[PDB]
């Protein structure tokens, strides 16, 4: 009863480096110069159509 | 965190040679110097030497030359570059050398000198 790994027939695989982690760190997306980011401050808002605030 | 872990307290004989290790963890070990200092009752502190773990360049106290020796061991892997070990072989043991030994590291601030020893080992008591 001899086996092999599954991905051998399609792709050589890459170990993750144990030094780097996978935990989420929060990104803040920022607009460059000459643009702006608007935010809907409304409460009842299905994401389509007018946002009054 | 910055951790300094020494070895246990040891009992030696006169004329012997003690080896004391100092494992350091939690920073890039190749950057900061490691100093060694001693504490004798009724004598206060006394400085022993420093070692720069990048190459191992050492400097000893003048009145301890010929007796002391300092080496280091670096971490050679791309996974744990943080830890390292310092050593101190203190030789020519006399009954006066019964003391508690500390391995220390300076701070990381900009106005920190070398001698403002921030982080301290727990100490190793040597009784001759």
């Amino acid at each position: 009863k001899e086996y092999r790994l599954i991905n051998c027939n399609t792709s050589a695989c890459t170990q993750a480096c144990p030094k780097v982690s996978f935990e989420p760190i929060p990104i803040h997306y920022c607009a460059p110069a000459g643009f702006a980011i608007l935010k809907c401050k409304d409460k009842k808002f299905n994401g389509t159509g007018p946002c009054p605030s | 965190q910055v951790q300094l872990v020494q070895s246990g307290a040891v009992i030696k004989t006169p004329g012997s040679s003690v080896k004391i290790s100092c494992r350091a963890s939690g920073y890039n070990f190749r950057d900061y110097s490691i100093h060694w200092v001693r504490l004798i009752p009724d004598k206060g502190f006394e400085w022993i030497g420093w070692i720069k773990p990048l190459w191992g360049a050492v400097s000893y106290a003048r009145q301890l030359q010929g007796r002391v020796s300092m080496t280091r061991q670096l971490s050679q892997d791309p996974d744990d570059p943080d830890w390292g070990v310092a050593y101190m072989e203190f030789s020519g043991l006399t009954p006066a050398d019964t003391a508690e030994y500390f391995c220390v590291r300076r701070g990381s601030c900009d106005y920190c000198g070398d001698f403002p020893w921030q982080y301290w080992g727990q100490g190793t008591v040597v009784v001759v």
Binding site: P32, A33, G34, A36 | -
Partner: protein, 132 residues
């Protein structure tokens, strides 16, 4: 505790205000329009897009009468077929967002008229300083 006028003086703080009241603060929108291993190329092309668009806008001012006045009197009459609204109703009723949709259809006529006016003004000033 911050006050309504403080956030009025922020960036885009008068977009719902009347355009007569929004005219008091134009330098804020004009100021946050210039300054603010592979990713350096993306941020670098964003920065040069910003400065190149600012230069296009300053050139379109510069080919007209005003280089850095930020409020520019000029000498082409408003063809009243463009908007057919009264004066005090537009300076006290609408915002700028509401006005742009009213004049989006009648634009690039106005810019060509401004360039023609500036070319005529430069040749008339050339003749005036020529006979002097």
């Amino acid at each position: 505790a911050v006050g309504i006028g403080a956030v009025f003086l922020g960036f885009l703080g008068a977009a719902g205000s009347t355009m007569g009241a929004a005219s008091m603060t134009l330098t804020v929108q004009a100021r946050n329009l210039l300054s603010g291993t592979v990713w350096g190329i993306k941020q670098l092309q964003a920065r040069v897009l910003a400065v190149e668009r600012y230069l296009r806008d300053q050139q379109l001012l510069g080919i007209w009468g005003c280089s850095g006045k930020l409020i520019c009197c000029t000498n082409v009459p408003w063809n009243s077929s463009w908007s057919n609204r009264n004066l005090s109703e537009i300076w006290d009723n609408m915002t700028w967002l509401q006005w742009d949709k009213e004049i989006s259809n009648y634009t690039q006529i106005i810019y060509g008229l401004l360039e023609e006016s500036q070319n005529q003004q430069e040749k008339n000033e050339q003749d005036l300083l020529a006979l002097d």
